[PDB]
Coordinates of all heavy atoms in Angstrom, one line a residue:
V12 N -5.4 16.5 -11.5 CA -5.8 16.3 -10.2 C -4.8 15.5 -9.4 O -4.5 15.7 -8.2 CB -7.2 15.6 -10.1 CG1 -7.2 14.2 -10.6 CG2 -7.7 15.7 -8.6
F13 N -4.0 14.6 -10.1 CA -2.9 13.9 -9.5 C -1.8 14.8 -9.1 O -1.2 14.7 -8.1 CB -2.4 12.8 -10.4 CG -1.0 12.5 -10.3 CD1 -0.5 11.7 -9.2 CD2 0.0 12.9 -11.2 CE1 0.8 11.4 -9.0 CE2 1.3 12.6 -11.1 CZ 1.7 11.9 -10.0
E14 N -1.5 15.8 -10.0 CA -0.5 16.8 -9.7 C -0.9 17.6 -8.5 O 0.0 17.9 -7.7 CB -0.1 17.6 -11.0 CG 1.1 18.5 -11.0 CD 1.2 19.7 -10.0 OE1 0.1 20.1 -9.5 OE2 2.3 20.3 -9.9
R15 N -2.2 18.0 -8.5 CA -2.6 18.8 -7.4 C -2.5 18.1 -6.0 O -1.9 18.6 -5.1 CB -4.1 19.2 -7.6 CG -4.4 20.3 -8.6 CD -5.3 21.4 -8.0 NE -6.7 20.9 -8.0 CZ -7.6 21.1 -8.9 NH1 -7.2 21.8 -10.1 NH2 -8.8 20.7 -8.8
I16 N -3.0 16.8 -6.0 CA -3.0 16.1 -4.8 C -1.6 15.7 -4.4 O -1.2 15.6 -3.2 CB -4.0 14.9 -4.8 CG1 -4.1 14.2 -3.5 CG2 -3.5 13.9 -5.8 CD1 -4.7 15.0 -2.5
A17 N -0.7 15.4 -5.4 CA 0.7 15.0 -5.1 C 1.5 16.2 -4.6 O 2.4 16.1 -3.7 CB 1.3 14.3 -6.3
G18 N 1.3 17.4 -5.2 CA 1.9 18.6 -4.7 C 1.4 18.9 -3.3 O 2.3 19.3 -2.4
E19 N 0.1 18.8 -3.0 CA -0.3 19.0 -1.6 C 0.2 17.9 -0.7 O 0.6 18.3 0.5 CB -1.8 18.9 -1.6 CG -2.5 19.6 -0.4 CD -2.3 21.1 -0.3 OE1 -1.2 21.6 0.1 OE2 -3.2 21.8 -0.7
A20 N 0.4 16.7 -1.1 CA 1.0 15.7 -0.3 C 2.4 15.9 0.0 O 2.9 15.9 1.2 CB 0.8 14.3 -1.0
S21 N 3.2 16.3 -1.0 CA 4.6 16.6 -0.8 C 4.8 17.8 0.0 O 5.7 17.8 0.9 CB 5.3 16.7 -2.2 OG 6.7 16.8 -2.0
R22 N 4.0 18.8 -0.2 CA 4.1 20.0 0.7 C 3.7 19.6 2.1 O 4.6 19.8 3.0 CB 3.2 21.1 0.2 CG 3.7 21.8 -1.1 CD 2.9 23.0 -1.4 NE 1.5 22.7 -1.6 CZ 1.0 22.3 -2.8 NH1 1.7 22.1 -3.8 NH2 -0.4 22.1 -2.8
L23 N 2.6 19.0 2.3 CA 2.1 18.8 3.7 C 3.0 17.9 4.5 O 3.0 17.9 5.7 CB 0.6 18.4 3.7 CG -0.2 18.2 4.9 CD1 -1.6 18.4 4.5 CD2 -0.1 16.9 5.6
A24 N 3.7 17.0 3.7 CA 4.8 16.2 4.4 C 6.0 17.1 4.7 O 6.5 17.0 5.8 CB 5.3 15.1 3.5
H25 N 6.4 18.0 3.8 CA 7.5 18.9 4.1 C 7.1 19.9 5.2 O 8.0 20.4 6.0 CB 7.9 19.6 2.9 CG 9.1 20.5 3.1 ND1 9.0 21.8 3.6 CD2 10.4 20.3 2.8 CE1 10.2 22.4 3.6 NE2 11.1 21.5 3.2
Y26 N 5.9 20.3 5.3 CA 5.4 21.5 6.1 C 5.5 21.2 7.6 O 5.7 22.0 8.4 CB 4.1 21.9 5.6 CG 4.0 23.0 4.6 CD1 4.2 22.8 3.3 CD2 3.7 24.3 5.0 CE1 4.1 23.8 2.3 CE2 3.6 25.3 4.1 CZ 3.8 25.1 2.8 OH 3.7 26.2 1.9
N27 N 5.3 19.9 8.0 CA 5.5 19.5 9.3 C 6.9 18.9 9.6 O 7.1 18.2 10.6 CB 4.4 18.4 9.7 CG 3.0 18.9 9.5 OD1 2.2 18.2 8.8 ND2 2.7 20.1 9.9
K28 N 7.8 19.2 8.7 CA 9.2 18.7 8.8 C 9.2 17.1 8.8 O 9.7 16.5 9.7 CB 10.0 19.3 10.0 CG 11.5 18.9 10.2 CD 12.4 18.7 9.0 CE 12.4 19.8 8.0 NZ 13.1 19.4 6.7
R29 N 8.7 16.5 7.8 CA 8.7 15.1 7.5 C 9.2 14.9 6.1 O 8.9 15.6 5.2 CB 7.3 14.5 7.7 CG 7.3 13.0 7.7 CD 8.0 12.4 8.9 NE 7.7 13.2 10.1 CZ 6.6 13.2 10.9 NH1 5.6 12.3 10.5 NH2 6.5 13.9 11.9
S30 N 10.0 13.8 6.0 CA 10.7 13.5 4.7 C 10.1 12.3 4.0 O 10.7 11.8 3.1 CB 12.1 13.3 4.9 OG 12.4 12.2 5.7
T31 N 8.9 11.8 4.4 CA 8.4 10.6 3.9 C 6.9 10.7 3.6 O 6.0 11.0 4.4 CB 8.5 9.4 4.9 OG1 9.9 9.3 5.3 CG2 8.1 8.1 4.2
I32 N 6.6 10.5 2.3 CA 5.2 10.4 1.8 C 4.6 9.1 2.3 O 5.2 8.0 2.0 CB 5.0 10.6 0.3 CG1 5.5 12.0 -0.2 CG2 3.7 10.2 -0.2 CD1 6.9 12.1 -0.5
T33 N 3.5 9.1 3.0 CA 2.8 8.0 3.5 C 1.3 8.0 3.1 O 0.9 8.9 2.2 CB 2.9 7.9 5.0 OG1 2.2 9.0 5.6 CG2 4.3 7.8 5.5
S34 N 0.5 7.1 3.6 CA -0.9 7.2 3.4 C -1.7 8.2 4.2 O -2.8 8.7 3.9 CB -1.6 5.8 3.6 OG -3.0 5.8 3.4
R35 N -1.1 8.6 5.4 CA -1.8 9.4 6.3 C -1.9 10.9 5.8 O -3.0 11.5 5.8 CB -1.1 9.3 7.7 CG -2.1 9.7 8.9 CD -1.3 9.8 10.1 NE -2.0 10.4 11.2 CZ -2.0 11.7 11.5 NH1 -1.3 12.6 10.8 NH2 -2.8 12.1 12.5
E36 N -0.8 11.4 5.3 CA -0.9 12.8 4.9 C -1.6 12.9 3.5 O -2.1 14.0 3.2 CB 0.6 13.4 4.8 CG 1.3 13.2 3.5 CD 1.8 11.8 3.3 OE1 1.8 11.0 4.3 OE2 2.1 11.4 2.2
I37 N -1.7 11.8 2.8 CA -2.4 11.9 1.5 C -3.9 11.7 1.7 O -4.7 12.3 1.0 CB -1.8 11.0 0.5 CG1 -2.0 9.5 0.9 CG2 -0.4 11.2 0.2 CD1 -1.6 8.6 -0.2
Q38 N -4.3 10.9 2.8 CA -5.7 10.9 3.1 C -6.1 12.3 3.7 O -7.2 12.8 3.4 CB -6.0 9.8 4.1 CG -5.5 9.6 5.5 CD -5.9 10.7 6.5 OE1 -6.9 11.4 6.4 NE2 -5.1 10.8 7.6
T39 N -5.2 12.9 4.4 CA -5.3 14.3 4.9 C -5.5 15.2 3.7 O -6.5 16.1 3.7 CB -4.1 14.7 5.7 OG1 -3.9 13.7 6.8 CG2 -4.3 16.0 6.4
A40 N -4.7 15.1 2.7 CA -4.8 16.1 1.6 C -6.0 15.8 0.7 O -6.5 16.7 0.1 CB -3.5 16.0 0.8
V41 N -6.3 14.5 0.5 CA -7.4 14.2 -0.4 C -8.6 14.9 0.3 O -9.5 15.4 -0.4 CB -7.7 12.7 -0.6 CG1 -8.0 12.1 0.7 CG2 -8.7 12.5 -1.6
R42 N -8.6 14.9 1.6 CA -9.7 15.5 2.3 C -9.5 17.0 2.3 O -10.5 17.7 2.4 CB -9.8 15.0 3.8 CG -9.2 15.9 4.8 CD -9.1 15.1 6.1 NE -8.9 15.9 7.3 CZ -9.8 16.5 8.0 NH1 -11.1 16.2 7.7 NH2 -9.5 17.3 9.1
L43 N -8.3 17.4 2.1 CA -8.1 18.9 1.9 C -8.8 19.4 0.6 O -9.5 20.4 0.7 CB -6.6 19.2 1.9 CG -5.9 19.3 3.2 CD1 -4.4 19.5 3.0 CD2 -6.5 20.4 4.1
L44 N -8.4 18.7 -0.5 CA -9.0 19.2 -1.8 C -10.4 18.7 -2.0 O -11.3 19.5 -2.0 CB -8.1 18.6 -2.9 CG -6.7 19.3 -3.1 CD1 -6.8 20.7 -3.5 CD2 -5.8 19.1 -1.9
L45 N -10.6 17.4 -2.2 CA -11.9 16.9 -2.5 C -12.8 17.3 -1.3 O -12.4 17.2 -0.2 CB -11.9 15.4 -2.6 CG -11.2 14.8 -3.8 CD1 -9.8 15.2 -4.0 CD2 -11.4 13.3 -3.9
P46 N -14.0 17.8 -1.6 CA -14.9 18.2 -0.6 C -15.6 17.1 0.1 O -15.2 15.9 -0.2 CB -16.0 19.0 -1.4 CG -15.4 19.3 -2.7 CD -14.5 18.1 -3.0
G47 N -16.5 17.3 1.0 CA -17.2 16.2 1.7 C -17.6 15.0 0.9 O -17.3 13.9 1.2
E48 N -18.5 15.2 -0.1 CA -19.0 14.1 -0.8 C -17.9 13.4 -1.5 O -17.8 12.2 -1.6 CB -20.0 14.6 -1.9 CG -21.2 15.2 -1.3 CD -22.0 14.3 -0.4 OE1 -21.8 13.1 -0.5 OE2 -22.9 14.8 0.4
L49 N -16.9 14.1 -2.0 CA -15.7 13.5 -2.6 C -14.8 13.2 -1.5 O -13.6 12.7 -1.8 CB -15.1 14.5 -3.6 CG -15.6 14.6 -5.0 CD1 -17.1 14.5 -5.0 CD2 -15.1 15.8 -5.8
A50 N -15.1 13.3 -0.3 CA -14.2 13.0 0.8 C -14.5 11.7 1.5 O -13.7 10.7 1.3 CB -14.2 14.1 1.8
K51 N -15.5 11.6 2.3 CA -15.6 10.4 3.2 C -15.7 9.1 2.3 O -15.2 8.1 2.7 CB -16.8 10.5 4.1 CG -16.5 11.3 5.4 CD -16.5 12.8 5.4 CE -16.3 13.4 6.7 NZ -16.0 14.8 6.7
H52 N -16.4 9.2 1.2 CA -16.4 8.0 0.3 C -14.9 7.7 -0.2 O -14.5 6.5 -0.2 CB -17.3 8.2 -0.9 CG -18.7 8.3 -0.6 ND1 -19.4 9.4 -0.3 CD2 -19.7 7.3 -0.5 CE1 -20.7 9.2 0.0 NE2 -20.9 7.9 -0.2
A53 N -14.2 8.7 -0.6 CA -12.8 8.5 -1.1 C -11.9 8.0 0.0 O -11.2 7.0 -0.2 CB -12.3 9.8 -1.7
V54 N -12.0 8.6 1.2 CA -11.1 8.1 2.3 C -11.5 6.7 2.7 O -10.7 5.9 3.1 CB -11.0 9.1 3.4 CG1 -10.5 10.5 2.9 CG2 -12.3 9.3 4.2
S55 N -12.8 6.4 2.7 CA -13.3 5.1 3.2 C -12.8 4.0 2.2 O -12.2 3.0 2.7 CB -14.8 5.1 3.3 OG -15.4 5.2 2.0
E56 N -12.9 4.2 0.9 CA -12.5 3.1 0.1 C -11.0 3.1 -0.1 O -10.4 2.1 -0.3 CB -13.1 3.1 -1.4 CG -12.8 4.3 -2.2 CD -13.5 4.2 -3.5 OE1 -14.3 3.2 -3.7 OE2 -13.3 5.0 -4.5
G57 N -10.4 4.3 0.2 CA -8.9 4.3 0.2 C -8.3 3.5 1.4 O -7.4 2.7 1.2

C-alpha cells in the first residue's frame, strides 16, 4: 500500500509538472486510493 500511494504521489506530482513531493498531493492521493471511510479519518489525523 505504501508503494501504491507513493507511486500515485510521485505520478500526481509529475502529472501537474511539479518536481516536489509535499503533503498536499499525498493527501490528494490518499483520498484517491483509500475510499471515504478510509479517507476523511485518514486525512484528518494526517
Side-chain angles (χ1 to χ4, degrees):
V12 65
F13 150 77
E14 192 294 341
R15 283 231 283 271
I16 185 69
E19 201 66 279
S21 188
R22 289 188 300 275
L23 188 153
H25 184 276
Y26 263 80
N27 307 129
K28 185 33 52 193
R29 191 67 39 77
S30 65
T31 309
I32 296 89
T33 63
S34 179
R35 204 189 169 265
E36 89 284 347
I37 63 175
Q38 64 65 20
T39 307
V41 63
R42 100 190 196 90
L43 280 177
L44 288 294
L45 289 62
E48 296 298 343
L49 273 41
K51 278 73 176 175
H52 294 89
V54 300
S55 70
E56 66 182 2

